[PDB]
Every structure is written in C-alpha cells, then in structure tokens.
Design a protein around this motif. Structure first.
Motif, PDB file in Angstrom:
ATOM      1  N   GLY A  15      14.556 -58.173  32.292  1.00 42.15           N
ATOM      2  CA  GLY A  15      13.312 -57.654  31.740  1.00 42.15           C
ATOM      3  C   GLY A  15      13.430 -56.215  31.274  1.00 42.15           C
ATOM      4  O   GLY A  15      12.977 -55.856  30.175  1.00 42.15           O
ATOM      5  N   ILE A  16      14.042 -55.365  32.106  1.00 47.84           N
ATOM      6  CA  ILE A  16      14.190 -53.965  31.719  1.00 47.84           C
ATOM      7  C   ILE A  16      15.035 -53.854  30.460  1.00 47.84           C
ATOM      8  O   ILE A  16      14.718 -53.082  29.545  1.00 47.84           O
ATOM      9  CB  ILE A  16      14.787 -53.140  32.871  1.00 47.84           C
ATOM     10  N   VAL A  19      12.897 -54.832  27.288  1.00 49.16           N
ATOM     11  CA  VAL A  19      11.942 -53.837  26.804  1.00 49.16           C
ATOM     12  C   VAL A  19      12.669 -52.616  26.254  1.00 49.16           C
ATOM     13  O   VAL A  19      12.236 -52.015  25.261  1.00 49.16           O
ATOM     14  CB  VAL A  19      10.937 -53.443  27.895  1.00 49.16           C
ATOM     15  N   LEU A  20      13.773 -52.216  26.890  1.00 45.78           N
ATOM     16  CA  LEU A  20      14.518 -51.076  26.373  1.00 45.78           C
ATOM     17  C   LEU A  20      15.033 -51.353  24.968  1.00 45.78           C
ATOM     18  O   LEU A  20      14.971 -50.477  24.098  1.00 45.78           O
ATOM     19  CB  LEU A  20      15.667 -50.720  27.310  1.00 45.78           C
TER      20      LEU A  20
ATOM     21  N   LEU B  12      11.775 -60.795  36.626  1.00 37.63           N
ATOM     22  CA  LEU B  12      11.521 -60.442  35.237  1.00 37.63           C
ATOM     23  C   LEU B  12      10.163 -59.770  35.088  1.00 37.63           C
ATOM     24  O   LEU B  12      10.044 -58.708  34.461  1.00 37.63           O
ATOM     25  CB  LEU B  12      11.612 -61.699  34.373  1.00 37.63           C
ATOM     26  N   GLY B  15      10.082 -56.238  36.651  1.00 40.30           N
ATOM     27  CA  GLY B  15      10.788 -55.246  35.854  1.00 40.30           C
ATOM     28  C   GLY B  15      10.031 -54.837  34.606  1.00 40.30           C
ATOM     29  O   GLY B  15       9.916 -53.642  34.296  1.00 40.30           O
ATOM     30  N   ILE B  16       9.501 -55.817  33.871  1.00 40.61           N
ATOM     31  CA  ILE B  16       8.758 -55.479  32.662  1.00 40.61           C
ATOM     32  C   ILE B  16       7.514 -54.677  33.020  1.00 40.61           C
ATOM     33  O   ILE B  16       7.124 -53.755  32.293  1.00 40.61           O
ATOM     34  CB  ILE B  16       8.414 -56.743  31.858  1.00 40.61           C
TER      35      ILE B  16
END
Lengths: 392, 392
Positions: A15-16, A19-20, B12, B15-16
């Motif tokens: 997820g990180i 988005v990054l 997920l 983290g987002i």
C-alpha cells in the motif's frame, strides 16, 4: 505455514509503495521544470527500478514452483528445513520500493540542504549495499551471506567448480547488464564531470565535458557491458574441461561467444562513423549479419535444449513435449511467441546501448526496452526448472 | 486462522491510511492559510473520525476478549457458526478511514472540479449509510443485518424485550452523543445556514443569523444531547417493570436522569446569560452541585457493580476483587486511575457542547475532548463483560 505478521507486512508495504508511486507521478507531471536536464535522474534510478522488479518476479517464480509441485529445494541443493517463501521476497521488494520512491521524491523536491539535490542517490545506493552486506545475525541471516558467497564464487568462476546454482545466477546476471552499465555511468559522471564542491547541478550539454560518459573514446563501456557473457563463456569452458564432453558445452560456448563479436563490431562501426571513414557501411552490413547469426542461434538453443520442445516424439502433445506438468497450454504458446519477439529486442537494446546512435532518442529506447528482458527471464525460469526436474 | 488474504487486506488498508494521514498533515501545514476559518470542516469530519476510532477500539476489544478466554459468544448469545474476528473489524475501519482521508483531501485541495467543497461529506456519509443497509448477500451480510435488526429492537425498547446486547449498544451510543450532535449541526447547516446557489464554499460570516446551529434556539440542542439518556432511562424502566427488582433498576433511573437535570440547567443558565439576569449566578452554584451529583454518582455505579471492585472479600488483591483472570493487575490500576479523570472531563464536555459559551475557545475544547470518551468506553468494555462472565 507463514505467520500472519509476514502477510500484514506485505500488505503494508504494498500500500505504501502504491501511494508513493501515485504521488511521485503527480509531482513529476506538475512540479518538474521543463528546461532543466532530467535524463541523468532516469539513468541513475533505472538500475534500482530494474532490481526491484526482478526481485518481485523472482518471488512470483518461487511461489509458482512450490505450487506446481516441482521439488526445487533438492535440485537447488538448498536446505530443506530452512528455505525462503515468496512472502519474504515480497516484503523485501516492498521495502526497497518504499526507499526508492522516497529517495526519488526527495531528489525531486529538495526542501533544503547544503548540497542542493545530488546527495540522496549516493545515500540510497549506500543503504542498499549496507542491507546487502549486513554482518548481524538478523534479517534472514541465512539468505544474505549465501547470496554473497554465490556472487563471490561466480565473480571468481574459472577456479571453482560450476554447479546448477552457479550458472543459473550467472545467466540471471546476464539479463541485468543495464545494472552495471548505469553503475559505470554514475561512476564516470560523479568522478570526472561533477564537481562535488559546487552548486546547482544543471550544467549545459553544450559544455565540452558534457557527454564524456556518453562517448566511447575510452572503450571500456563495451567491456563493462559484455562482462556477463565472458563469465558464462569461461564457466562453460571450465565445465567442458572438467567433464570432457565436447558437444553441449561447445555449443553453449558458441552461443555465448557470438555477443563479443556483436559488441566489438558495433563499437568499431561507431568509431568509424564518427571518424568519417569512406566505407563505414560494410561494418553495418556484417553488423546485421551478426545480428541474424546471434538471434537465430540463441533461439534454437533456447527452444531446443533448454525447454526440450519441438521434439519428434511429441505424440498427442502437438507443439509441446510428450510430458508436461503445467496444464495451461496457452501459457506455453504465449511464452514461445513472446520469447521469439523479445529475443531480437534484447540485442536491439544491446546495440543501442553500445553504439551511441541518436543521442536524443537512444536513451529513451534503452529505458523502454530495459524492463522487458527481465520479464522474459522470469517466464523462462518456469520452463527451465520444469525441464531440469523432469530430466533429473 | 483466517486466509492470508484477510491479513494482506488489513495491512494494505492500514498502510494506505497512514500515508494518506501523513500527506494530509503536510498539506494542511503547507497549503492552508491561517486567516481563513476552518472550524466548520473539522466540526464536520469529527463524526467520521470518532466512528473510525470506535471501530478500531472494538476490534482491539474483541481480540483481547478471545485471548483472555472469556466465553463472550454465549453472553452475547450470538450464533457460533458466524462470528467476526478482529481482522474483519480492522479491514472495515481501514476502508472507512481511507475514504475519510480522501474526502477531506478533496475538500482541502479541490484542484479541478465544479463544486469546490460542499458535496464530498454528503457523498461520504451517504455511501457509508448505504453500505450499512445494503440488502445484498455480500460484504458481511449477516453482521450488518443483525446489527440493523438489533438497532430496530433498541429504538423500540419500551415495546420490545431488553437484553445484554441492547443495553450494551445503548451505552455505546450514550458515549457517542457527539456524532448525533454533529449530525444535527450538519443538518441545520445544510438546510438553513449554508449558501447553496454560490461558489467557493466557506466564507467569513459575521451576521447574527450565522451560528444559529451554535445556538440552542428553544430546545434543539439539549434534547439531542439527552436522547441516549432518555433511551437508557426507558430501557431501565421497562426492565424494572418486567422483573420487579427495586435496588438496581431504580438507582439506574437517577443514573440516567442526572444528566438530564444537568443539560436542562445548562440550557436555563445559557438562556439567562443571554438575558443577563442578576440572579444568574445562583443557577451557577447548583450547576456545580448538579455537576457533582452526576459524576460521583455514576462513578459509584461503575466501580461497585459493573466492574464490581471494592468487594469486602478483596483479600490479597488490594482495592480489587478476589478473582481476576487478566494476567497483570497493572491494567486494573491504570483503569481505576484513568476512569476518575475522564469521567469528570466527560461531564464537562457534555456541559460545554450544550451551554453555547466561550465562542472562540469552547469549540477547541469540544474538538480535543471528543476522542477520549470513546477510549474510556473501550477500557470499560473489558472489565464490564469480564465481571458479567464471572457473574454468569
């Protein structure tokens, strides 16, 4: 059974990373000023992107091998009680993606520092290597030193015996020549043209020192590109000399020897065209001749011996081998056709990398076609290991 | 253990959510101008933030309940073939947090759009309520349908039988009167205050008619505050009417009517301040008294019956019970020390969000004091159901 904490980590990292990537795309389309030269940034971060991608598809490969029932630990001489599952590879890939995205974004914005924007990439690659060379008994205290030992043994190949792992890893390196090419480019840029005790970082390309890394007057770029071919050639020669069996090892040596002729002829044509010699076209001619003689021959080595396909004892399994393990035949056919198509593109990328034609476009072409042969290697590994398991 | 897809989704979403929160904080610190009023936006999003925090704490509660070994399924009288583990609550909470952050960011930036800021909260809350009442057989159909049925049972408590889950959610709603108050604020803002046929969105307003939702009008502020009090009151009255026991069901009457007295006295005091009568300070005095008789009475209900400490057979467990299943008593001591602090603050918050005093600072106290009573009730749930299990 993997602990749920590993899966949670995988999700968090994915997820990180997602988005990054999104926010970096937005910053790229918006904040980037258009006059400033941007190509060095891609030529620097392309290696990191390629390595991260390769790690991801390697994890996919090992998951597929485990699911298909192919006993791979024994043929990899790996320890049965201590093996790496795909989840760990996914965590590594996600962590590396996080750091790469952060580094690129920091280079992009650069709020404040002493050196304006050229400090982050060195720290980034330092973090990567320090992760690689971590001496503590943590973070998979088995895999890191094992990989380091294999890499060192491959680097000094002509003295030790060559096994399955040795040539497997060597050929995997054979597809990551862009890694070492960009690494050499970064050394050349940071050592000669870049003034560390300076400011800015937008030196015009009209300057005489500009494009020195792009020129081949030193002639080491071809050698640094063809290292892996040399390594594989000498490993197969040593294997022959050890076993004394001419046919397979000599054919393999030929297939890995065509590429020195490739790069040497391309470089000589390049120097003759920049020298304005009258007959520069003949070396182009034999350049295409060597193109065909290398492509067609690596094709037959890949399809005939590596996968054991197109065999006359196919029987009812038309266009495949008599015995198969993966049920989807369409995957087989797609893999064959895609392998054929990208085999020529791989040597196209080699030629543009080692020829210095079209400075405006050649970099773009190399960038787009770099992350494709790695996908080809990923799909290749499946059938290579299934064939090796069936043969064993 | 749930399938690894569950844990992967949990990671997920977490983290987002973290990355959206940090980028929103950075954007607020950088983009926002200080001069422009922001209070309506935070007053709108407070309800969503409180709901998300409540869901997360409920997930932690059920994890702890399963771990401690208390047979919560029988006490809740739920079906053993369909129960939700903590991971399901975690994924729901993460999802709603994701949309909350996305909507707030869309309201904040509004890069390219038609309607700048005054459609997103409506869409978010509408999608949430639709998700609650989706009649299809997907996305935890049983839990949502059962919760809707039990909500219907609770809201018709004077007619229907009262049970453990009924008064449990009644108490949870009692501590969550803040979302009801904010929802009514939004409703009146959307019906009468906000300028619909205009642009931009929030603009400086100094007229007397502005802030009517900050005003009590006649009773539209107290009654919404005491809806949970009235509901719990009639629940206990019906309970007394069906079992015919004096002590607990009659003390709980004062338990849930003292807050009614407090809010009514707050309304009269605020109206007298608007009128500016000389005798006003008199109603201040009993105010504190009517403050006191609330908190310290509620306190003596909690430690003595719901949690049941201070028992005459305490013995070796100082200031505790003779039987404790939780491993360390440190959590017990922490709960006892924190309960007194947060109870008084809860009564103060109930006073301030209804007296319409301190116009420029009272809302700040309300915003900062909203997200701790949820934590208090989270702490309360453990000991309450533990003592209920021991009573069973």
């Amino acid at each position: 059974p993997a602990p749920a904490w590993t899966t949670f980590r995988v999700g968090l990292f994915c997820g990180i990373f997602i988005v990054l990537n999104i926010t970096l795309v937005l910053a790229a389309v918006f904040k980037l000023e258009t006059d400033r030269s941007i190509w060095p940034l891609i030529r620097i971060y392309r290696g990191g992107f390629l390595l991260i991608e390769f790690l991801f598809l390697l994890g996919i490969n090992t998951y597929g091998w485990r699911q298909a029932g192919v006993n791979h630990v024994l043929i990899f001489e790996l320890n049965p009680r201590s093996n790496l599952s795909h989840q760990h590879l996914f965590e590594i890939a996600g962590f590396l993606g996080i750091l790469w995205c952060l580094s690129l974004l920091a280079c992009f914005f650069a709020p404040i520092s002493v050196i304006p924007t050229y400090v982050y990439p060195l720290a980034l690659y330092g973090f990567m290597v320090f992760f690689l060379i971590n001496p503590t008994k943590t973070f998979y205290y088995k895999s890191r030193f094992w990989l380091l030992k294999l890499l060192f043994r491959v680097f000094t190949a002509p003295f030790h015996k060559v096994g399955f792992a040795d040539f497997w890893l060597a050929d995997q390196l054979n597809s990551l020549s862009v890694i070492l090419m960009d690494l050499e480019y970064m050394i050349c840029f940071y050592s000669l043209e870049l003034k560390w005790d300076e400011s800015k970082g937008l030196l015009p390309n009209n300057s005489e020192e500009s494009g020195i890394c792009h020129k081949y007057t030193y002639g080491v770029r071809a050698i640094v590109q063809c290292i892996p071919a040399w390594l594989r050639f000498i490993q197969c020669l040593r294997r022959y000399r050890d076993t004394k069996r001419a046919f397979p090892h000599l054919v393999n040596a030929g297939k890995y020897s065509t590429t020195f002729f490739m790069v040497t002829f391309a470089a000589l044509y390049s120097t003759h065209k920049e020298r304005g010699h009258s007959d520069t076209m003949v070396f182009f001619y034999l350049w295409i001749v060597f193109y065909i003689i290398s492509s067609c021959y690596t094709l037959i080595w890949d399809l005939k011996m590596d996968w054991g396909l197109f065999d006359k004892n196919a029987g009812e399994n038309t266009f495949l081998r008599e015995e198969i393990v993966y049920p989807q035949k369409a995957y087989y056919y797609c893999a064959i056709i895609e392998d054929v198509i990208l085999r020529f593109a791989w040597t196209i990328q080699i030629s543009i990398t080692s020829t210095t034609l079209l400075p405006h476009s050649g970099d773009i072409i190399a960038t787009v076609f770099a992350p494709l042969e790695v996908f080809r290697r990923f799909v290749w590994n499946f059938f290579r290991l299934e064939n090796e398991h069936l043969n064993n």
